[PDB]
RNA sequence: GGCGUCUGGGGGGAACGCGGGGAAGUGAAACAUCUCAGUACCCGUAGGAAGAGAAAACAAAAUGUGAUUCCGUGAGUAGUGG
RNA sequence: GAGCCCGGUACGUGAAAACCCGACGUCUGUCUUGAUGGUGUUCCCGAGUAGCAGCGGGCCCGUGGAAUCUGCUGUGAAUCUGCCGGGACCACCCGGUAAGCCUGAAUACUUCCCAGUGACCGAUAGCGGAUUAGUACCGUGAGGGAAUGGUGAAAAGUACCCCGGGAGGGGAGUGAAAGAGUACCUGAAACCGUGCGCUUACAAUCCGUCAGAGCCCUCGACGUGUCGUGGGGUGAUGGCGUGCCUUUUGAAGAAUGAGCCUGCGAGUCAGGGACAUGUCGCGAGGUUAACCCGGGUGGGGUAGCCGCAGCGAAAGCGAGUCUGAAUA
């Protein structure tokens, strides 16, 4: 039967910390600092480079801009439909989120990555060709929105 | 609190889908009246970034 | 699956229940239930302990003594470390030792325990602990002893059935839980557990849904 | 959460001191005294370990030597001559021998005198 | 303005608030722009809490929301910047 | 070391008077002499203001293409086909109706008060202050700013005698113990001395170490004293041997620091922070935040975040995409 006094941690779990400046036969006298400098009194910045013009300053920016107004999709792939609708059928927003194959608040698109033998009445947002063509060969229905 | 990030680490660096860290490359602004474009030519495009200088970029853009 | 046969005071029983296979065929991981009785002490433990460092102490704000010509060190302040009197450097300061343990982790912990106490036959039901609405712990006692022999065990009792708390209360052993706080210290401390039969049913029927 | 640090130290100082009971002055009463001499103490043991050895057996060649200077043979041919008569016999117990029976240790003289070469400074 | 009468105010306070003023050492491996900080401090007034508060607001063609404030996230992001 | 001795707890009781909550009836107003809808046009819809220009503040926004909100000057309009905004601006649509005023609840805080909790301290700590403590003392002054806890179960605090001027002590006593005497729990080290054994006044010593004579103590087997698988203190004499730390190419170093003891004194904490790595749960899924309910450490809470497809400055396309006239 099980106590308190019966309870442990697993092997290699916990581990005991460097304690550091407490002895000349761990870590004395510096205490991994080394000696005299910058990096023993106190530390050192990352974005500083002696003197000379950092990395982050001598190569040029990256181009361009972003459109805020940016609309990103959130994929599916036809691989997936086929692995998680054995049956087929009417295949929506919601019955896409039932298995867990996009977000919540998911505005969708569907994508012909993976084969396609299944039949499913598929309901997004927008597709690619390669669905289009992929439905009208496994006889379903591609009827966006 | 939080970390707060590296702007120009942020501008002139970015990460591809394995990984990867990008640049882009120098003397491509102005002074191109004579250098020849062979030279102008194999300054586009992006590059990966070295090794030595990784670790220091992953250090700016995280945190 | 593991039957139990719930119990009277009088001396007779009077049904059995048919305990779940799931939530009482867990076997325990003992980190798992290391770790989460860890975060219970931790949680309970408050965190009323600071010191003053060399800033908030009295005094000290000016240099007691010159920098030269004396002899003697260099100062800055009367309530430096190194002084009698002095800052504490790196102190205790108040700080809160709660860890967020997850509910899977946490449950998992609980139907463990519960198995672990099943399979060795420490789970026992009965429907009360006493005669009608007057609490008197010699009959609580009286039952105990029935029913059980060991030092320590813990009671489910709901919230109520306040008589047979008030009357199991003062035991020297004892150590009372409602059922919708149920935990793990207090079920792993114990070497008996006396279940209500509303209790399991609470237990089971919101667990199980 | 304190811990007062009194009982950590008194151990080691009293180990210590008592491991200095004979030295001569501060070096017996003071810790920050002892612990110094205790690390010259300890290495000069160390090192005169290894050396007594060389000291005990540049005795015994002494003596042996004298011994045989006494019986009219060298030391440097006396040990040819035992080594070439396969004899086993260490310095340490050549030496007892000496002390004690000269006698036998004539007649390990003798038996060296036979064993050596004839022309002791040839070619060979 | 002078005379009489009647009622108020006057100062203290440990923090907390609102309006106003308002630095510097520090960081930038120098430094003035910047930052430290609209912090410390100073002023005038409060209350048991204060201030804000009922759309001359958000939003994006969705048939939407519906006073304000304080918390979690959005976000160390869009961006701003010798 | 007390569940059953005491104080008190679980529990139930209790307020003449004052104070606070509502509850009422007074008292006070207030609509009641009224409303729902109709119908075509004049009038009103908050003025030195909104707006524009010039210097400025603050808004993610450092004068920039820079809206909205605003401060001082100067100029200065209309009332519903009116006006203000939807990040210069213009036309369309949308929303809203400024320049008059009040507004609770959620929120922040503790000089003081009440009751408790502590993997907080326990007299060089903890509030500076367990002791007359913001006192003594210092400074002209603003202002600084200390030190000192413990007899024992109860003072039964040594009556009496002797030495002494007295302090102080020795006996006699109290007391379980005066190795508890109002300098008092225990009572370390440095430090100060008294006795006992060895050794030391012809010798050049980082003060020790290895060998070791001689003497003294001790345990044991024996025999009139005696070696031993011994052990311990001193130790003549011989050999070897240049303090400790820091910092230095290099210090026994005539380079720095330390008079000695005792106590105190320096990689810590926060945060769903970042990266890497062990361990545990779950597993193409994982996890909740604030908050609500909970005497407790427990249950809920889908807003969110990370993954699950990327390329491209961007539109955009999609296991492909970008450049390019091009599958080159």
């Given at each position: 039967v099980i106590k308190l006094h019966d309870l442990k941690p697993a092997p290699g779990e916990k581990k005991a910390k460097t304690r550091v400046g407490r002895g000349e036969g761990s870590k004395g006298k510096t205490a991994g600092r080394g000696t005299k400098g910058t990096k023993a009194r106190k530390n050192v910045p990352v974005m500083f480079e002696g003197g000379q013009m950092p990395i982050h300053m001598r190569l040029p920016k990256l181009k361009g801009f972003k459109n805020r107004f940016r609309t990103e999709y959130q994929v599916v792939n036809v691989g997936d439909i086929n692995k998680a609708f054995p049956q087929g059928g009417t295949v929506g927003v919601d019955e896409l989120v039932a298995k867990g194959?996009?977000?919540?608040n998911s505005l969708v698109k569907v994508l012909g990555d993976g084969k396609l033998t299944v039949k499913v009445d598929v309901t997004a947002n927008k597709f690619s060709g390669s669905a289009r063509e992929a439905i009208t060969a496994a006889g379903g229905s591609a009827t966006e929105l | 609190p939080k970390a707060k990030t590296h702007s120009g680490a942020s501008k002139r660096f970015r990460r591809t889908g394995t990984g990867k860290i990008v640049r882009q490359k120098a003397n491509r602004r102005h002074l191109l009246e004579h250098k020849p474009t062979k030279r102008t030519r194999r300054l586009d495009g992006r590059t990966t970034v070295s090794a030595a200088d990784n670790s220091r970029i992953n250090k700016l853009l995280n945190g | 699956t593991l039957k139990v046969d719930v119990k009277t005071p009088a001396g007779k029983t009077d049904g059995s229940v048919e305990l779940p296979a799931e939530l009482f065929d867990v076997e325990p991981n003992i980190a798992l239930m290391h770790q989460v009785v860890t975060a219970q002490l931790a949680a309970k433990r408050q965190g009323t302990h600071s010191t003053k460092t060399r800033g908030e102490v009295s005094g000290g704000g000016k240099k007691p003594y010159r920098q030269k010509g004396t002899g003697r060190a260099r100062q800055g302040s009367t309530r430096a470390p190194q002084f009698t009197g002095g800052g504490t450097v790196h102190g205790p300061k108040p700080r809160d030792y709660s860890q967020r343990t997850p509910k899977k982790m946490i449950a998992a912990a609980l139907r463990g325990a519960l198995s672990d106490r099943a399979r060795n036959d420490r789970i026992h039901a009965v429907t009360e602990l006493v005669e009608g609405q007057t609490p008197s712990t010699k009959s609580a006692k009286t039952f105990l002893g029935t029913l059980t022999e060991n030092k320590k065990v813990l009671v489910v009792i709901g919230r109520t059935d306040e008589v047979g708390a008030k009357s199991v209360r003062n035991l020297p052993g004892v150590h009372v839980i409602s059922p919708d706080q149920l935990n793990t210290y207090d079920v792993l401390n114990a070497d008996d557990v006396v279940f209500s039969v509303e209790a399991l049913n609470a237990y089971i029927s919101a667990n199980s849904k | 959460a304190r811990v007062k640090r009194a009982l950590n130290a008194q151990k080691k100082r009293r180990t210590v001191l008592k491991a200095s009971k004979?030295?001569?002055?501060?070096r017996s009463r003071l810790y920050r005294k002892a612990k110094e001499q205790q690390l010259h103490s300890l290495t000069y043991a160390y090192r005169d370990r290894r050396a007594r050895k060389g000291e005990f057996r540049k005795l015994w060649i002494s003596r042996i030597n004298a011994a045989a200077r006494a019986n009219d043979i060298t030391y440097n041919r006396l040990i040819q001559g035992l080594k070439a008569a396969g004899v086993e016999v260490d310095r340490k117990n050549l030496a007892e021998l000496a002390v004690s029976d000269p006698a036998a240790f004539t007649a390990l003289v003798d038996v060296a005198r036979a064993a050596l070469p004839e022309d002791v400074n040839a070619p060979s």
């Open positions: 194959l996009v977000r919540k | - | - | 004979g030295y001569r002055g501060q």
